[PDB]
Each structure stands twice: as structure tokens, then as C-alpha cells.
Write a protein that binds this ligand. Structure first.
Ligand SMILES: C[C@H](CC(=O)N1CCC(O)(Cn2cnc(NCCN3CCCC3)cc2=O)CC1)c1ccccc1
Ligand SMILES: C[C@H](CC(=O)N1CCC(O)(Cn2cnc(NCCN3CCCC3)cc2=O)CC1)c1ccccc1
Lengths: 337, 350
């Protein structure tokens, strides 16, 4: 890792978006710190996702060589192309974040995943004719944005919190209060320190009974203000977000080219992670070059960090953060391996 | 206010002398503070546990906007009167505190933090000149006591620290079955730790007045302290270059004098004066030269240096994530119980 200071993951033909996601998660320093601190001494090295994740993260930080993922893929049972083909990227993220979240429960680092990744939203129904609502709170770890017909992220959030009028034919059934003229919608209460946006390029096609990739132009900013999509905003902490990672795909199928762009320290110093090969690149290469347009190349997932949280999220990782139990277990594995 | 400097003070609660100064010093040893928050004080008594009590002080220092109290802390290690403080040099309290938490860290993810941060290695020797005999005693140290009497600066104290003493004449060395021998006695530094705690020995027994008195002679200490020359063997990759982190100061002639501490917590030459509740930004000159000394009785008695190669690890940033929710909930719980004791104690009395 001589040129950038960052090491690659081995090209695995069978794993598609995984390398891109693992880098993105590794560079979420506070998650990596939590993960290192997880107590995993009495686990099976084949089968535990936490332990496999510790290994990958450890090796990504310390190895001079491209890091392998086979024990990781083994641990969560996605050991073939087909597993990746049948899951959106956020579902893999959930497989990973969920395993480590619930292993952190009752530990010194409990509550770290939700503190980093969990925002809150309400799905509401509001009858305009009589005062009956149906406010429904709900946690989220990621947001799936519509890009079809949308110029940019801003327009996707507008659409995301757009008002559907429930009138005439499709009035809201209030059950005991009958049919009601209402408006349906979603409001954000909070946005987390680390904001995972998936761009919904893969859409079902009635004409061919299949998912197809939309390669249309869709713009995302380096700096993303989000106060206007919140219910109540905070004066001391505006929802101003900083672009941290761009997960990119070239082509129209799972055999295409998966890379990830990252500015790991949050300083606009961008790197391209193309499996084992990691190289410095321009902001333009990481950002505008991946807006897409009409086999070719665009973003399908973005990671933003809340600007007020950058120093927490991207806290430097120190030897303190890796317990010797962990250093030694991983040494002992390599001892046999 | 914490609003001026970003740092909060410790309450002035009776005469605990040098404690507040030492507490702030240890708090801004970030790596230590992180380890402390990590100690499994799950079912510790709050009145008895020094580890828990320290976690409370460090936590309140990191989050309180008001001055932080130390009464449960003083109670936990049993120093509740002026005499407890008068019968201990500053390093003795530090040892009590570091040893408690060092022991509480045993079998935890943060075991060996205390020695990693504070433990250096030395050898004291006696070599016979005329005969082939040598006693060597390897020892760990967590602090160093420097002689200032007739020393201009730290460099001179260190020279004197490793100076060879000729055992000849009347005070010959007893070499066992070699009889008395001309010997020479000395101390060698093998290693210098990442955090270097230097006490300046201004408090010395005075025969004529049969008491310890404070010596207020001028004694100079650098911002940047090179120590390679005092190592038995140097390291080409990691020279013993030190950075002044803190200057613990005293004003007056006895334990009822004034204790403050100067600290540039980030190790960036940006200094604040910590005077109990009142923390204020100050000049580098107020911190360093103005505490050289030389009735002027305001001067440094203890210095904290951090090795330059370790600075960013010792002073690594502390965030909310470095405090387990379990600890935060536990310290909230103690606050409620103490709030209730305020009411309970007042009902008995009124
Ligand atoms: C052909 C590849 C397949 C792929 O690796 N991935 C599938 C799509 C991907 O998950 C991003 N994304 C995530 N959730 C979406 N939700 C709506 C549609 N899905 C629901 C069921 C399956 C499709 C839609 C979407 O687009 C990224 C990984 C691709 C498609 C589109 C963009 C890039 C690459
Ligand atoms: C009057 C105060 C008392 C005080 O709070 N302290 C006593 C001395 C202090 O502990 C620093 N220091 C530490 N180990 C020393 N060792 C030799 C003398 N001691 C041996 C047993 C007791 C005296 C000598 C010394 O000087 C700092 C706190 C004072 C005296 C001198 C400088 C500053 C303040």
C-alpha cells in the first residue's frame, strides 16, 4: 500500500459489489473501531461474520497485499455468484451491519451501528376533512432514491417526501370513520451521521419480466444540504452532508465492472478502489464522471457523512482500538494458515 | 466558563493541594482517559472504587459545562484531610491512581495501558574498580525525581541523575567476600516512556529548621527536550525527543499555597492555565519561562513531557464513542442517587 497508503481487496468474480461495499465500511472509521473492539474470542473462524469482518478490516489496515474475502463470504453463506445476483447492495450491508450490531449488544461498544447509521422517519396519513392522522414512526439504515426522470439527488428527496393526494376513487379508508379525503407521505425526523443512499438504477421491466439497469444521467453533489427534507431542523447542527464514497458500476449486468471511489479522510483527496489496484484520482473522476448517461459507467450507491459528525465518524484508528486478544487471534490463524 | 477555552475546571473543595493539577494532567493524557472509560466497573461501589470515581471525574471533565467535583474520588482512595496530602509527594498520589486503574484493566481489552504509557526501564549498578564484581539492579519507573538544587536546567538535572559516584575513601563499597572495594555507582536509562513524568525536587529536608522547605531557585526547562544522550543505547528510528505537555505550578511556601497547572492539551503549543474552576487561555511564556522561578515563590514542581513519535497516539482524539453507553447510563444513575442524597440528607437535618 505504498502509493496511496490504502490496500486493495482481491478480485472475486463471484462477489460483484462486495469489494466496493467493504472498502466503504472499512473507511467508516468508527464502525471499524467498534468492530475491532467486539469480543469474539469464543467463535468459529469459518462461521462468525463478526470475526470474519474483523479479519478483513484488520487486513485492509495492516496488509501490504490484496486482501481476501473467502472466509467472510463463507461466514454469511453467500458463496456463489447467485447470492449476489439475488440481493441488492443494501441487503448485503444489512447482513454485515446486523451481525455486528447484535454481537455488540451487552458490550463496551453497544449501540454504535445505530448511532452511526440509523435515522428516523414517519409515514403519515392526514385526513384534511377531519382531525385524524395515522403518523407511523420507522427507523432506517439506508435510503433508496428514485433516479428515473430525476435530474439529481435534490429532486429524488423532493419526490421521496412528495404528497400523494388520496381523493375521489382512492380516498383513505379510516374504518370506523369511513372513506376520507387525505394526503399520504413520508417525513424525515433525523438523518444519521453516515447516510447510505442507494440510487435505484435496477428496475423491473414489464416488457421483459426482468430487472434492467437504467444508465440515465443522475447528478449528486460533493456537498449535500438536507435541512429542507427534515420535519424540524436544528439551528446548531444543520443537515449538511459531505460526499465520502461513490459505488460505481460499468455495464448493464452483474458481470460488469465494480469499483468504488472514496475520499477516506473526508478531505476531498479521492482514490479509486478497483479491487487490488488503488490509485489517486480527481474529484471529477469520482463525482461528475459517474453521473452516467445515454456498456457504461455510473454511481449506484453514495455515502455521505454529516459534516458536524466527520471527526467522530472518521476518528483516526489507533493501536488502542485493536485489543491484543484480536491481534493475537488473527496472528494465530495466519500461524496455521 | 468552558465557553472560553473548551475545557472545564475542577472544584476548589478544601485543600487537596496538587490533586486538581494532577487530575487535569491525567485527563489530557487522552490514551489513558480512553482506557479508563473502558474499565469494567459494572458492580463497583461508588464510595470505594477509585476506577469508577475516576471514570466519573474524566466523564464530567469531558462533558460538564460546570466545575467538576472530586469528593467521591478523594473518599475512594481515602485521602480526605490536608494531612493525607502533606504526607505524600505528588508522584505518590499519581502512583496510587495509576495503580488502581492499571489493576482494574487486568483481563480487559485495555490491559497494559498504564505501563505502555508511563513505564520506563533503568539499571542501577555498582562496579568495583580493583576487582571483577558488579551488582546490577534492573527497575521499572513510572516517574523520575530530578534534583534542582544547584542545577540550572533539566539538562543539568539529567546529567546529575546519571552521574557516576565514586565509592572510595571512608564510604567504600562492601563487596562481600572481596572486602571493602573502591567502586562506582550510577544509574542508566535503558528506555524513556511515551509520557514522561518529571518531579522537580524543590521540597527538601532542611537540617537547621528540622523541616522540609521549598527551594525557589531558578530552574529552566525547555519546550523541546532532547534526551537521547541520557539513554544507554539510542534508537535511530525513534529519538528520545520530548514535547512539554504540562507544567504543574505552586505559589507560596507550604501546602496552603496556590496550586495550578499549565497545559497545552493537544501538544500544539496552545496553552491554558487550569486554576481549579477557572480555566483561561495563556501565553506559552506564562506556562514555561514565567514558572522558571528564581518574595518570588511561584514555580514548577512537576513537568509532563510526551515523546514526539508518540504524541498523536497519546493525545489521540476522544469522542462520545470512546465512552460505553453502559458507563454513561451508570454515571447518570449515580447522579440521580447523589441528587436524592442531597434531598435525603436535608430532610434529616431540617
Ligand atoms: C446489474 C447490476 C446489479 C447489481 O450489482 N446491483 C443491483 C442494484 C443495486 O443494488 C442498487 N439498487 C439497489 N436497490 C434497488 N431497489 C429497487 C430494485 N430492486 C428490488 C429487487 C431487486 C431490484 C435498485 C438498485 O438499483 C446495486 C447492486 C447493477 C444495477 C444497477 C446499478 C448498478 C449495478
Ligand atoms: C510546599 C509544597 C508542598 C507540595 O504540595 N508538594 C511537595 C513537593 C512535590 O511533591 C514535588 N516533589 C516531589 N518529590 C520530592 N522528593 C524529595 C523530598 N520528599 C521526600 C519525602 C517528602 C519530601 C521533592 C519534591 O519537591 C510537589 C507537591 C511544595 C513544595 C515544593 C514544590 C512545590 C510545592
Amino acid at each position: 500500500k505504498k502509493h496511496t497508503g490504502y490496500v486493495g481487496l482481491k478480485n472475486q468474480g463471484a462477489t460483484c459489489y462486495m469489494n466496493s461495499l467493504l472498502q466503504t465500511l472499512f473507511f467508516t472509521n468508527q464502525l471499524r473501531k467498534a468492530v475491532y473492539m467486539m469480543p469474539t474470542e469464543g467463535d468459529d473462524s469459518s462461521k462468525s461474520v463478526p470475526l470474519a469482518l474483523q479479519r478483513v478490516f484488520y487486513e485492509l489496515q495492516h496488509s501490504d497485499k490484496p486482501v481476501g474475502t473467502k472466509k467472510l463470504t463463507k461466514s454469511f453463506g453467500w458463496e456463489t455468484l447467485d447470492s449476489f445476483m439475488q440481493h441488492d447492495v443494501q441487503e448485503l450491508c444489512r447482513v454485515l451491519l446486523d451481525n455486528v450490531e447484535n454481537k455488540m449488544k451487552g458490550t463496551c461498544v453497544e449501540g454504535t451501528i445505530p448511532k452511526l447509521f440509523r435515522g428516523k422517519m414517519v409515514s403519515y396519513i392526514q385526513c384534511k376533512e377531519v382531525d385524524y392522522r395515522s403518523d407511523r414512526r420507522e427507523d432506517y439504515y439506508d435510503i433508496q432514491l428514485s433516479i428515473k426522470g430525476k435530474k439529481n439527488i435534490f429532486e429524488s428527496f423532493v419526490d421521496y417526501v412528495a404528497v400523494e393526494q388520496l381523493d375521489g376513487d382512492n380516498k383513505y379508508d379510516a374504518g370506523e370513520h369511513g372513506l376520507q379525503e387525505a394526503e399520504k407521505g413520508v417525513k424525515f425526523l433525523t438523518l444519521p451521521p453516515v447516510l447510505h443512499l442507494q440510487l435505484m438504477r435496477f428496475m423491473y421491466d414489464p416488457q421483459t419480466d426482468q430487472n434492467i439497469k437504467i444508465n440515465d444521467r443522475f447528478e449528486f453533489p460533493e456537498q449535500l444540504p438536507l435541512d429542507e427534507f427534515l420535519q424540524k431542523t436544528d439551528p446548531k447542527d444543520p443537515a449538511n452532508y459531505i460526499l465520502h464514497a461513490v459505488l460505481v458500476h460499468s455495464g448493464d449486468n452483474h458481470g460488469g465492472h465494480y469499483v468504488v471511489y472514496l475520499n477516506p479522510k473526508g478531505d476531498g483527496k479521492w482514490c479509486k478502489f478497483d479491487d487490488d489496484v488503488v490509485s489517486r484520482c480527481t474529484k471529477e473522476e469520482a463525482i461528475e464522471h459517474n453521473y452516467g448517461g445515454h456498456h457504461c459507467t455510473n454511481a449506484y450507491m453514495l455515502v455521505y457523512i454529516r459534516e458536524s459528525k466527520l471527526s467522530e465518524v472518521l476518528q483516526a484508528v489507533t493501536d488502542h482500538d485493536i485489543p491484543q486478544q484480536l491481534v493475537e487471534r488473527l496472528q494465530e490463524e495466519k500461524r496455521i494458515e
